[PDB]
Design a protein around this ligand. Sequence first.
Ligand SMILES: Nc1ncnc2c1ncn2[C@@H]1O[C@H](COP(=O)(O)O)[C@@H](O)[C@H]1O
Ligand SMILES: [Ca+2]
Ligand SMILES: [Cl-]
Ligand SMILES: [Cl-]
Lengths: 731, 116
Amino acid sequence: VKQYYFARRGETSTHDTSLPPPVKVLSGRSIPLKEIPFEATRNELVQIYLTSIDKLIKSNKLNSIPSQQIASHYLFLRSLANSETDGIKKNQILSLAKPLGTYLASKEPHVWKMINELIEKSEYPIIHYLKNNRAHSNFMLALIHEYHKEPLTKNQSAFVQKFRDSSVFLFPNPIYTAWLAHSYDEDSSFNPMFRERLSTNFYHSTLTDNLLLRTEPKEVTLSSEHHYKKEKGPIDSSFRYQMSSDRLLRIQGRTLLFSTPQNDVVAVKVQKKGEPKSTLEEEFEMADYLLKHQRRLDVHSKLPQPLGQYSVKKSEILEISRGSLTLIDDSKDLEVYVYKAPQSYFTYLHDKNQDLEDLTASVKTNVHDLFVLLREGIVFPQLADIFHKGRYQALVQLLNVLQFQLGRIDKWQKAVEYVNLRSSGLADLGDSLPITSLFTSSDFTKHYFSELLTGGYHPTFFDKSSGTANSLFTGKRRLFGNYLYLNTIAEYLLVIQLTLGSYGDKVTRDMDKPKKEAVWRELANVMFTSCAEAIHIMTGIPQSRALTLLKQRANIEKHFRQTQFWMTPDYSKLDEDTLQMEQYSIYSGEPEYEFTDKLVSGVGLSVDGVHQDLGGYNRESPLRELEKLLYATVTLIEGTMQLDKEFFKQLEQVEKILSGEIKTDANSCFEAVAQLLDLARPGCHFQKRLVLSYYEEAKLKYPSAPTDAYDSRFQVVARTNAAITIQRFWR
Amino acid sequence: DQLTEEQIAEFKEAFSLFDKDGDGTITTKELGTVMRSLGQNPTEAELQDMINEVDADGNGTIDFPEFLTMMARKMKDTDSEEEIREAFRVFDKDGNGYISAAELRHVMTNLGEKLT
Ligand SMILES: Nc1ncnc2c1ncn2[C@@H]1O[C@H](COP(=O)(O)O)[C@@H](O)[C@H]1O
Ligand SMILES: [Ca+2]
Ligand SMILES: [Cl-]
Ligand SMILES: [Cl-]
């Protein structure tokens, strides 16, 4: 039967609508907050870079630059030129790049050979030449400071002081988008971690920010039949369960679990002290909507069957229970939601009684429905109660001004103590939310993400002469929906990590060190698989490859060793010199997690002395590889969408050149087809097959033209496609 | 099933790539382009088996083997060797092992048809 979504996603003009006024009030004074344009400031610095290449050539001091750094200038100029459209502005760049060619070919002839293998490989050879430690060398800003002997404007200062870590942050949109998605390939040694003068710099969050600022504001359009648009009839609670005390199995919080001859459970959830009746009507109407569209969405969870939503005298509820047992409402009438669900629906995903076989498949069930329903337009913002208002931001560096590093998770075990991820799948479905509430000035967004919607102040942003605070951050008001989108993805995957960590800590307590490391190794593998499965649902990328793209940016060994270290309490029984001696094993290049707090024995780092925290008091989380893993995950998802977007925008051009809708010469048509191959996904063949078919069709529209440059790069696509048609035909 | 997993995901990614609106349904206009990428340049596929007007992946991985179990697979495996045959009638001496080392898979390719 049918399988589709009731959500069609597109683009809009601006998310800055019904937003709070962009103003910081500081001590009676009111300070306007102003956007610093990204692309307008980007082109300024490139133009300064281009003008500075001229001053470098006129200065004759080409030998004062290492050949590796000249190879950067040349390759970028060659890449920037082919990204250019009109032949006049294109040749001005090629004029600048030729003296760097006659120098390299004359003076450093071996470097000339090596990059000449790249120029025959790609229209943007710089994106591959920067697949390694060379990307940490900012050659563009180095030349600007050396030859542009003139102070930069206040905006150019802000852009540079924000994107100092690499030159790729100055590339035009197609080159950065392509360089970023190609930095995860099998031949890429790029990790955003440079070591300064004994300091180690991480800029994995800066990649995602430089990517988002070039994007267009997303907008999701929910169908007429969606759960949040279709007018719903009243809940038909025609039947009333007969609350039997002998069949009262248990009492989970405020839910009474009742036994039943069918070996399932009839659960009755009671009105809480503060919850209105609507919160219970919602859980009913969502379970129905999901049971209805279960097949249509391929929901793997065992959804509960809703039975009734009706009022009940509190005297009956209080009398029905006399077991172990405070949280219900006061005295008269407790509104009720009664449902039927398996016994799995009540074992939390972190139950120590789950073997790795059952846990793994129950985790996979949850992460599937989590992201499958996300595309449908349903968001679950209350899966767990995580705090550092006070809620925890998974992608915190993208949503706040200072936000140097991640946050301290306070409970991390009491946060997922009663998580809404069960062994049966999703639970508590009433705490749902339309995805549109992420892309609009809802009560949710302006309360929890007020700084992202307002604009951000810092004294370094203040212009004493202008009276305004200027920042790149205030540009996010136009795009804030996309930020909360990717934050939601990491939010989901973080709750899986705290759940797995709770399971790990509980089964390894009172346990053979090599047998205990086995549990933590597999739990590291379940998290890596879970992130990769999300990329598959969101981008169509084969999970097997999305996992390899992931394992270029995230170290599964470190993540296994940091989780085992910081989620178990055993490090509390270590002395100061022996503790730092063991932290080197979980990081091994990165700086040890520096902290000052007193270690609570038997627990570890704890603010309240009872429950373990994840990090020092006002410090960051020591789970550093988790922070990389979440940022690598959301950068692959949004970075893939953007590459596919830049891919399709070029695919139109070549279709308008071949079909005749745009008149252009031959060697300028092949340039359009060869550039399309650079915008294909890494590892994706049918994209490369398509641009091969487009190429052959071009050699019929321009049969008189030579194909010296575009021969080998399309031959390998032919050899790869040929070799697949004998490998994929070895049935 | 009757379609192997090696090309199921290839169909899944191609469908999810051209499903530009993310609805899980694809239109006829784009459908032609997804097959040229998948390796078919058909004549008139407007004859199909859908619900009313458009098709999902469920309708895709069923419609596609109907058009995949038609192919002259022998007419293709010969064409793949022509991409490697230098002059003619000589597929490859050592390239057979090499060109299969890293394209899609390589695990002890049975060395039959040897220099016998
Ligand atoms: N405000 C809420 N409304 C409904 N369910 C919730 C709410 N907050 C948490 N839950 C989850 O719902 C399940 C049943 O407990 P309860 O919180 O009483 O509904 C548990 O998994 C809770 O974590
Ligand atoms: Ca569609
Ligand atoms: Cl320099
Ligand atoms: Cl910023």
